[PDB]
Amino acid sequence: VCVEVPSETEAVQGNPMKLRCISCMKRATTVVEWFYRPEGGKDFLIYEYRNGHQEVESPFQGRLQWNGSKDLQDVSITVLNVTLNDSGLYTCNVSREFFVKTTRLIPLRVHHH
């Protein structure tokens, strides 16, 4: 069955990081938006599912990898090759029609070694 599990919030520099986002659903059109915000900055979109997985232009374009389910209850993504600079707040927005909308916040912090 579908369990809602929070994402890890600590990442090791140089490894891939899974930004977990799970929205267990009510027995359906889906939109998923992933946002990132650097310390002292503004949210910008980095990943989108909106009638398909869209190419989103961002500093993240190139290092993102989809890691979710086909049923779209798991909408996790992976950031490849993590740097100290990827620290910040990641937001996962999942909306569902035929209405719902759920938000998940990931205060991501990257470490050495």
Residue numbers in the entry: 1 to 27, 32 to 102, 110 to 124
Q: What does the primary publication say about this deposited structure?
A:
The vertebrate Nav channel is composed of an ∼250-kDa α subunit, which contains the ion-selective pore, together with ∼40-kDa β subunits that modulate the voltage sensitivity, gating kinetics, and trafficking of the channel. The Nav β subunits (β1 to β4) are related to the L1 family of cell adhesion molecules and are thought to possess a single extracellular V-type Ig domain, connected via a stalk to an α-helical transmembrane domain and an intracellular carboxyl-terminal region (4–6). The Ig domain contacts the Nav α subunit and modulates its gating properties. Here, we report the crystal structure of the human β3 subunit immunoglobulin (Ig) domain, a functionally important component of Nav channels in neurons and cardiomyocytes.
The structure was determined to a resolution of 2.5 Å, with phases obtained using the molecular replacement method. The β3 Ig domain assembled as a trimer in the asymmetric unit. The β3 subunit protomers in the asymmetric unit are related to each other by a pseudo 3-fold NCS axis. The total buried surface area within the trimer is around 2565 Å2. Key features common to all Ig domains are present in the protomer. These include a buried disulfide bond (Cys-21–96) that stabilizes adjacent faces of the molecule and the presence of Ig domain-typical β-sheets. Instead, the region is held in place by a surface intramolecular disulfide bond, Cys-2–24. An intramolecular salt bridge between Glu-4 and Arg-115 further constrains the local conformation of the peptide chain. As a result, the side chains of residues Val-3, Val-5, and Pro-6 are surface-exposed. These residues from each protomer provide the main trimer-stabilizing hydrophobic contacts.
